[PDB]
Amino acid sequence: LRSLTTVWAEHLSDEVKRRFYKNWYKSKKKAFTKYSAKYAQDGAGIERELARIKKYASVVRVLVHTQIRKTPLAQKKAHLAEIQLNGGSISEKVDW
């Protein structure tokens, strides 16, 4: 299996965005800013990538992250991982 592309969400929580940093406090928090700029339009780079994932990509996995602000740990850095979707067709998985 080879990853074709990863489509992301318009707004990323600061908890998950903290995962992409090793020194988050001393940073400009520039993370997914240009991706969100690519967002706010219908399908300039989003619906087309999802159509690519539907046309190809026999396996689709959803990227998720944990709500560790809710969890009582001192972490504040969301664990983000991949969970495979195992039902329906590729189109159904992608639009799910």
Partner RNA sequence: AAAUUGUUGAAAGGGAAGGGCAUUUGAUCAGACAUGGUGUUUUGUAUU
Partner RNA sequence: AUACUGCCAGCUGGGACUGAGGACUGCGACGUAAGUCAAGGAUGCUGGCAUAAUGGUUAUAUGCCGCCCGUCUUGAAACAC
Partner RNA sequence: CCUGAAAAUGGAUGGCGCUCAAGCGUGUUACCUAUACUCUACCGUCAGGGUUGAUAUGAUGCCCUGACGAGUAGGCAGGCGUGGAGGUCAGUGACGAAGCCUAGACCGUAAGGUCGGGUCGAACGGCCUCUAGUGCAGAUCUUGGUGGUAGUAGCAAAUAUU
Partner RNA sequence: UUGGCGGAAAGGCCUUGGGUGCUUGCUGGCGAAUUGCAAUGUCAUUUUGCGUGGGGAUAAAUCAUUUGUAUACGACUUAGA
- Give the closest residue to 13 by CA, choosing from 32, 37, 41, 35: 32
Among 32, 77, 93, 94, binds RNA (CB under 7 A): 77
70 is a site residue for RNA (CB under 7 A):
no
3-class SS string, 44-71: CCCHHHHHHHHHCCCCCEEEEECCCCCC
| Of residues 22 and 70, the one with the C-beta less far from RNA | 22
17 is a site residue for RNA (CB under 7 A):
no
Amino acid at 59: V
Provide the binding-site residues for RNA, judged by CB under 7 A: 2, 4, 18, 21-31, 52, 56, 73-77, 79
